[PDB]
């Protein structure tokens, strides 16, 4: 993934010519109406040339065999571009199937670590099966970590060897098969049965067996068919038109004229632009469900981003224990430890760890206290332990203050100042309360991903508004929004509020791009038109979202916009190029076609072509060669530039609009000159 | 000569724009379902009497109302021509028309084509001209304007399943716009010398002693609606070249203005309804640029005229053959472009006698689908088809979803737009080909060589595009030509209306999206050039082979 091979590898070019030959079958050509006409015309000219050779029909057999041969080259060149794009696509798919499956799964009889493990091959693992793994092994199947925490190497899938952190109880519980556990151990509960693995999602992404045409391709095909219909009528009716003014134009010339007129350049390359664009997504470490969602990224005007997990690296670690007035640091840690004994969230574990070195307290366990724990919830924004009589709770400032006011008491003035102080630099303030008495605040440091500021500047230039939606405190969100470069933010946002914001933006008709990492983003990821899920997040977010980013880049929408706009631009530019190519075809064939029926029409031979037969041949040869010459353009796409709509259209109309008017004039003239020099004409 | 031609074009366009702007405001009120001042009281009583409750109808019901009214008018006109001898106002006992001539004439006037394979002064009675032809001149024109009303409403309406009431639109267009404007034009025509009477034919004892029989009839009333509604059906065979129809150059100038009046006002009304006048001006800019160039080429071609005239012994080579002295070569050239860029079809000069290049441009103007100001209503939605192609290509080239006036363009719109665009060129090429493979079609030619093929190509192109003008040398009064052109006129008219109505039905249900920073503007020189390029390139590439064997071969010989 992300390691490019070549544009013309010798191993795949020879395999593409073999697949192009087997694509000459009428069943394969039936699904492409533009190329089917060329296929039919090639057979008609071949049969006509056979009749002239046998003497059954008067005419020049060599000329008909020369037109028919290049007509077969045109359909072979179109099938070669499609095979090259598909062959390069299946090469990436074959690269991913190559991931090694350990088949060494230590299934556990019971979930708790330390049980006896029985040798079971990986393929027998199904949903709900607990598998124990040790350092240095390979994860057998995708699942959610149920216990333990260790480093995981995901270079097999993401292509980068930087270790990641996987642990239970948080947003790092999701794990994927084929990765290598690094440090201690994990206890993974398989969540997907075989056949629905994340790797299968990546394969079906580039396998392209039965590719589904996007609505843009379908709409373009309608126009291409309509142009073919009008050119077929304008060529078929030419025979009775010329038959009255003299000898009728030969069928071979009419077939050659029709192929040169119908949009063979875009028609033969249309099936290669879609596959190449999907292959460029894999090179960008983006796994898209379908090409339709990719093309929707060219119209998005606002981008919604999560803070923790997406913009920041997550794994919030407590830094200092700031105590309230009248409370010492020793007392603060004791309450903090109690509320985080069973807290498996990354913040909860950091609370317990930080307290040990500060004060070496005896390691209490949950069963020793005979108490229950309140798990952290996005809606509640608080957690703690309801031990006998005494109550310990911690959570967000707003959640704790509301709970304190309902129970009774008032927030100390120093505490409110401390909350603002610790939220100014960017640390999220956690307020811990003991019953109705506030004990202090805890500062959770977070790390903002590097380079996000300049990437966000590129999004601003692209006309995309970046909004940071988070449920954290308003004061700390502003210090993180200004440390990332986003336009606007929305703090203290419940998971039901992010969904409302996407619907509110979609109400006006705009397209919303949403990126998220946590499980609470899954409802808001299925609503946005363009949804990108980090590979380091949960499995629920990965399936709810349209695309998955393997590099966990919050600003990965830039690459999605590139390819999404590139596919549309390549289709439009090539369509304009093909239609504009017909002007020189008329100046080369019409004077040649009626050289004997109307000698006065030779005044339109502005290119001064040598012979009427050489004039028609040069147009047919150029028609075939232009497809092969534009193969790298279709595979790479039209270059994208961050310009305005009126400036991008102007530049594209100058390169492919005016360029399409002038290129065939030079190309046909050069081919005609070469034929004259070689003595063929 | 060039200065005189430039002044004529500038004066015609300046006066047309001045008159069309107030009419656009009035047409915008009809589109917005706002009654014109002073008509609210009359409309309430009239609508109740006629059983029209202004009930909103969808595109299927709106299309059926237009189709039903046209079919009813077709049957009435067809039987009126057949039983003309049994009808009053027949001072000359002209018999009923033949089945093929009546069918062709009935279809021609219903489809707003007004192709005529007869001579009115010796074929039709006053009743047939007044109650049969003039009635369809009003009704066919109102049908086209009603359809473009629905399409304009589709763009300006949000999440709606209805496009107004067709019966209300037809009554409002005919009674408040077509009838009063035609009456003023007709009265001006009478003052200048046009005929308006019901007297029998007048015998004339000439100065030299010969006998002349002057035809009569209510010419002026028919002439006004013939010009205003882009009908083009002349009372006499000479059409607008007849002195009794177009007596002076003053009437001729008004006739050209009346051709472009409603089509230009519709563009002005389109911008006002959408709330952005730049959109309406963009359509006029694209239409005017093509129109201005076309007039200059025809004027230049006709000025050179016949090269043999100087050698034969004349003092000038200007092509005065088939032209009126009171108009001149320059005015005849302008009228030919105006009547062929639009779907009017009236002629003040014989297009068959035009030079090879002089007659090629009017023929090509018809072949591109009649989008250079087009007919009444038909030109606007004909240009809308090319606008949809333009935004589809422009949107792809900028990496954005195609859009026009904030409405997304989907697969269904492209499917209908492609079908609508393909209808007319298919009939022109297939119809002309069928004539060339039959003795009956070929024998109708008058001139030999490539110009003979131009007569056949012009006839089919005019009928399929509902223009009505002709290379009059062709003898089309045959059952083969009457039936073939009737099929082309019928399919060429209603075969575009049905997909356009379906386009309005699909677009009206959508909700317009507000323009963002990345939205491509649809106004300005860049989009005007793109729209012009889309129209010209599609139109040229389709008809280059046919034109090469016709006027191009004639010009180069």
């Amino acid at each position: 993934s992300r390691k490019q091979l070549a544009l013309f590898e010798p191993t795949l070019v020879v395999q593409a010519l073999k697949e192009a030959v087997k694509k000459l079958n009428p069943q394969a050509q039936w699904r492409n109406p533009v190329m089917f006409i060329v296929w039919i015309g090639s057979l008609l000219t071949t049969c006509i040339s056979i009749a002239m050779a046998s003497g059954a029909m008067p005419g020049n057999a060599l000329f008909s065999a020369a037109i028919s041969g290049w007509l077969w080259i045109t359909v072979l060149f179109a099938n070669f571009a499609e095979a090259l794009a598909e062959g390069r696509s299946k090469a990436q798919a074959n690269s991913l199937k190559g991931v090694k499956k350990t088949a060494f799964a230590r299934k556990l009889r019971e979930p708790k670590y330390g049980a006896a493990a029985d040798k079971v091959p990986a393929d027998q693992l199904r949903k709900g099966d607990i598998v124990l793994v040790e350092a240095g092994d390979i994860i057998p199947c995708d699942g959610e970590v149920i216990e333990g925490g260790a480093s995981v190497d995901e270079s097999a899938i993401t292509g980068e060897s930087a270790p990641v952190i996987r642990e239970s109880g948080g947003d790092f519980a999701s794990v994927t098969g084929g990765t290598r556990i690094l440090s201690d151990w994990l206890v993974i509960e398989c969540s997907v049965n075989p056949g629905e693995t994340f790797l299968d999602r990546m394969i079906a992404m580039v396998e392209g067996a039965q590719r589904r045409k996007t609505p843009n391709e379908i709409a373009l095909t309608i126009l291409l068919i309509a142009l073919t219909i009008v050119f077929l009528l304008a060529t078929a009716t030419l025979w009775p038109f010329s038959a009255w003014g003299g000898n009728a134009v030969s069928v071979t010339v009419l077939v050659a004229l029709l192929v040169c007129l119908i949009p063979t350049t875009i028609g033969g390359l249309l099936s290669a632009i879609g596959v190449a664009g999907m292959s460029r997504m894999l090179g960008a470490n983006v796994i898209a469900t379908s090409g339709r969602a990719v093309e929707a990224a060219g119209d998005v005007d606002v981008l919604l981003l999560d803070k923790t997990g997406t913009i920041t690296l997550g794994n919030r670690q407590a830094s200092e224990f700031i105590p309230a007035q009248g409370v010492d640091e020793k007392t603060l840690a004791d309450a903090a430890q109690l509320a985080s004994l069973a807290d498996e969230t990354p913040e909860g574990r950091s609370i317990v760890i930080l307290a040990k070195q500060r004060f070496n307290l005896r390691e209490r366990d949950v069963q020793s206290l005979h108490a229950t724990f309140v798990p952290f919830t996005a809606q509640s924004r608080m957690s703690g332990i309801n031990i006998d009589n005494r109550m310990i709770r911690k959570g967000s400032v707003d959640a704790i203050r509301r709970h304190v006011e309902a129970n009774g008491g008032h927030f100390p003035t120093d505490v409110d100042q401390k909350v603002d102080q610790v939220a100014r630099q960017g640390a999220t303030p956690l307020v811990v309360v003991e019953g109705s008495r506030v004990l202090g605040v805890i500062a959770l440091k977070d790390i903002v991903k590097g380079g996000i500021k300049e990437r966000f500047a590129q999004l601003r230039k692209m006309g995309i508004k970046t909004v940071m939606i988070t449920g954290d405190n308003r004061l700390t969100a502003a210090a993180i929004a200004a440390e990332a470069g986003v336009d606007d933010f929305l703090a203290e946002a419940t998971p039901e509020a992010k969904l409302a914001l996407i619907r509110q933006y979609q109400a006006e008709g705009r397209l919303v791009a949403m990126t998220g990492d946590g499980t609470n983003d899954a409802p808001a990821l299925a609503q946005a038109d363009v949804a990108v899920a980090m590979n380091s997040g949960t499995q629920a977010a990965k399936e709810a979202g349209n695309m998955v980013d393997l590099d966990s880049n919050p600003t990965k929408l830039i690459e999605v916009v590139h390819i999404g706009k590139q596919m549309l631009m390549t289709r439009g530019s090539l369509t304009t190029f093909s239609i504009a190519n017909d002007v020189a075809k008329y100046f080369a064939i019409i004077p040649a076609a009626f050289a004997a029926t109307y000698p006065q029409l030779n005044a339109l031979n502005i290119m001064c072509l040598h012979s009427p037969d050489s004039a028609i041949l040069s147009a047919v040869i150029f028609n075939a060669l232009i497809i092969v010459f534009l193969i790298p353009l279709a595979l790479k796409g039209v270059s994208y530039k961050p310009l305005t709509a009126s400036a991008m259209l102007r530049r594209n109309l100058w390169i492919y609009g005016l360029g399409g008017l002038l290129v065939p004039f030079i190309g046909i003239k050069v081919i005609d000159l070469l034929l004259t020099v070689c003595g063929l004409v | 000569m060039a200065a005189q031609g430039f002044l004529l074009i500038a004066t015609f366009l300046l006066v047309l724009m001045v008159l069309a702007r107030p009419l656009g405001s009035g047409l915008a009120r009809l589109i917005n379902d706002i009654p014109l001042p002073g008509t609210t009281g009359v409309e309430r009583v009239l609508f109740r009497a006629l059983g029209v409750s202004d009930r909103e109808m969808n595109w299927k019901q709106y299309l059926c109302a237009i189709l039903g009214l046209n079919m009813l008018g077709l049957a009435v006109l067809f039987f009126m021509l057949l039983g003309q001898h049994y009808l009053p106002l027949n001072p000359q006992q002209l018999p009923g028309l033949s089945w093929d001539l009546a069918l062709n004439t009935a279809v021609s006037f219903v489809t707003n084509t007004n192709w005529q394979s007869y001579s009115g002064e010796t074929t039709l009675s006053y009743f047939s001209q007044m109650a049969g032809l003039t009635v369809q001149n009003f009704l066919s024109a109102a049908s086209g304007i009603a359809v473009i009303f629905a399409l304009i409403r589709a763009f300006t309406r949000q999440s709606m399943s209805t496009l107004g009431n067709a019966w209300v639109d037809l009554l409002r267009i005919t009674l408040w716009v077509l009838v009063p404007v035609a009456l003023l034009i007709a009265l001006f025509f009478i003052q200048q010398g046009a005929l308006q009477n019901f007297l029998p034919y007048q015998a004339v004892n000439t100065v030299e002693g010969a006998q002349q029989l002057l035809p009569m009839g209510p010419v002026a009333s028919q002439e006004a609606i013939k010009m205003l509604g882009t009908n083009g059906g002349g009372f006499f065979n000479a059409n607008s070249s007849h002195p009794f129809e177009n007596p002076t150059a003053l009437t001729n100038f008004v006739q050209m203005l009346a051709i472009f009046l409603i089509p230009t006002a519709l563009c002005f009304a389109f911008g006002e309804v959408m709330g952005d006048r730049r959109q309406g001006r963009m359509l006029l800019w694209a239409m005017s640029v093509i129109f201005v160039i076309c007039v200059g080429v025809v004027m230049w071609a006709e000025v050179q005229g016949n090269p043999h005239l100087l050698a034969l012994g004349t003092d000038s080579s200007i092509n005065m053959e088939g032209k009126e002295s009171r108009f001149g070569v320059l005015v005849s050239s302008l009228f030919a472009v105006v009547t062929t860029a639009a779907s009017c079809g009236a002629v003040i000069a014989m297009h068959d006698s035009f030079t090879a290049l002089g007659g090629m441009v009017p023929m090509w103007l018809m072949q591109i689908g009649e989008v250079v100001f087009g007919g009444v209503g038909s030109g606007l939605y004909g240009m809308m088809l090319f606008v949809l192609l333009a935004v589809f290509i422009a949107g792809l080239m900028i990496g954005r979803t195609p859009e026009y006036l904030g409405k997304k363009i989907d697969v269904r719109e492209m499917k209908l737009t492609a079908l609508a665009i393909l209808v007319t060129p298919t009939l022109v090429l297939m119809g002309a080909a069928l004539a060339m493979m039959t003795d009956a079609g070929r024998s109708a030619m008058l001139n030999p060589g490539p110009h003979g093929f131009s007569e056949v190509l012009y006839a089919v192109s005019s009928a399929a595009n509902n223009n009505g003008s002709a290379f009059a040398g062709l003898s089309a009064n045959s059952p083969f030509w009457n039936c073939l052109l009737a099929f082309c006129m019928f399919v060429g008219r209603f075969g575009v209306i049905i997909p356009v109505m379906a386009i309005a039905g699909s677009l009206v249900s959508k909700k317009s999206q507000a323009a963002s920073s990345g939205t491509l503007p649809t106004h300005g020189p860049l989009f005007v050039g793109l729209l012009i390029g889309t129209v010209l390139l599609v139109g040229a590439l389709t008809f280059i082979p046919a034109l090469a064997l016709g006027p191009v071969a004639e010009y180069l010989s």
Binding site: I37, I40, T221, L232, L233, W239 | K415
Partner: peptide, 29 residues
Amino acid sequence: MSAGVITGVLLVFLLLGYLVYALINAEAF
């Protein structure tokens, strides 16, 4: 009529019908 004209008319008609069918059902094509 010549036997080559007849076989040239049906071929155009079949191709036009195939393309018209393809345009109507462009989703499958």
